[PDB]
Design a protein around this ligand. Sequence first.
Ligand SMILES: *[C@](=O)([C]([C][C][C][C])[N]C(=O)O[C]([C]C1=NN=C(C2=[C][C]=C(C(F)(F)F)[C]=[C]2)O1)C([C])([C])[C])C(=O)[N]N1[C][C]OC1=O
Length: 214
Amino acid sequence: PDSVDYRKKGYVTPVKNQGQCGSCWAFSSVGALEGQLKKKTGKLLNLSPQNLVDCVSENDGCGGGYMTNAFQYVQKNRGIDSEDAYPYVGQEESCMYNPTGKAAKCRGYREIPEGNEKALKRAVARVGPVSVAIDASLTSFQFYSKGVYYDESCNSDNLNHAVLAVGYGIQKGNKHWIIKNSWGENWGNKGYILMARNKNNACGIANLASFPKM
Ligand SMILES: *[C@](=O)([C]([C][C][C][C])[N]C(=O)O[C]([C]C1=NN=C(C2=[C][C]=C(C(F)(F)F)[C]=[C]2)O1)C([C])([C])[C])C(=O)[N]N1[C][C]OC1=O
């Protein structure tokens, strides 16, 4: 069955709203972690993006960052706090990681071969929700609400926004990826957007994908 929806499997936490802070990579990172945590312990809980924003020295907090740097941070740190133990405030602050708030661990990360949607698909099915980067600068993207998103003008080399691939499927002859955003439930469709799958790596959905080894 060429389709899977981790939201129905209970691997995806409610949709979050990151505000203006450039923490998309943090929500994307916790997103993937929340999925592997659910898979391993059968427990579904919100992880702390604020933990990453203030602690991942390789990234730039509200200035932007890479998900792989984030996963690496949790691995070396041997842990990441839950959302409730280290609440999101929308601004970079000093690193306040607390071991008693440790909700999950991480053992490293794997990166899907660049631009290989076929591989990306395999990873989503085999491992679970995958962290991915895309060009989210278009107005068509930001005004998405229904259907399968596909805009030619999307620049697969202009990766600038981080999101989460929680699955994939097909709608009326248009294959797609089920993508979790971090702009609240009022954006897109209950917070999600279906992005063109197999339509020439649209928006570069497969140029920078990865998940945490748990
Ligand atoms: C995002 O889309 C974030 C914030 C963008 C603010 C520049 N985008 C993002 O992280 O993109 C990264 C690639 C990236 N872009 N900038 C950087 C970066 C900048 C500076 C440094 C440092 F100073 F450390 F050298 C390092 C890295 O990395 C990626 C494509 C890989 C996800 C977002 O949060 N969007 N926003 C902002 C406000 O509301 C939003 O939705």
